[PDB]
Amino acid sequence: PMEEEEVETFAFQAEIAQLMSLIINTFYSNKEIFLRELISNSSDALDKIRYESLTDPSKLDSGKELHINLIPNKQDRTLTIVDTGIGMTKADLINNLGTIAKSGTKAFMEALQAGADISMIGQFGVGFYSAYLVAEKVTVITKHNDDEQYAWESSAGGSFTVRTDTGEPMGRGTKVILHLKEDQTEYLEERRIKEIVKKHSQFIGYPITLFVEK
């Protein structure tokens, strides 16, 4: 019996779309900082659930462990960053991951044009989009307490989609699945991941574990 799923498509805010095009169609060295940006997001989300659970300990019913997992998959060429942080509601996804303007976007594009290192992306308030330095497509699966599990996805080009996720349930948190570009497969290698975590993500505040398939 055929299943029916609803999909909603959203336009990125105009300057966010411009930034994504810049990131994708311009050569930048030092792309490895994408992972720092994603781990920083996870750490921030872990702080949020940690503090919320001081007010309401039942907010940890959906899982007490506060941690980050990194999962390279050489078979399907994906690198996944999973956290057990606060997650995002549907409204959070739509608002926070593309539709609302960020005040630093224009300044950042000017900085890049003038030769700034791509590592400055976080300072300008748009760190997530560093994912597109290495990924041709990004899928974000997320589960916030008191809301359903959702999947956000974009291959850039000006829009993203959101749908209720009918895949494997997560208790609470977010998974960012990077479908790596063919020339960026170094980020599936355990040595390289270890190197960049050590270099850029030394003060995370939560355990991080790298899972490596035999």
Q: Which residues are annotated as a binding site for ATP?
A: 41, 83, 102, 128
Site residues for Mg ion, 22-41, by CB under 5 A, read 41
Q: How many CB atoms lie within 10 A of CB 77?
A: 18
Nearer to ligand ACP, 37 or 165 (CB): 37
Q: What is the closest distance, in whole angstroms, from the C-beta atom of residue 84 to Mg ion in the complex?
A: 17
What does 118 interact with, of Mg ion, ligand ACP, none (CB < 5 to 8 A by kind)? none
Interacting residues of 151 by C-beta distance below 8 A, sequence separation 6+: 139, 140, 141, 142, 162, 163, 164, 165, 167
Residue 127 found at the interface with Mg ion (CB under 5 A): yes
Nearer to Mg ion, 12 or 60 (CB): 12
**Bridge pairing between strands 149-154 and 135-143:** antiparallel
The contact set with ligand ACP (CB under 6 A) reads: 37, 40-42, 44-45, 83, 85-86, 88, 96-97, 122, 125-128, 174
The amino acid at residue 65 is E
What does 125 interact with, of ligand ACP, Mg ion, none (CB < 5 to 8 A by kind)? ligand ACP
Residue 154 found at the interface with Mg ion (CB under 5 A): no
The DSSP call for residue 8 is E
The 8-11 sheet, strands edge to edge: 8-11, 159-164, 149-154, 135-143, 173-180, 78-83, 68-73, 208-210
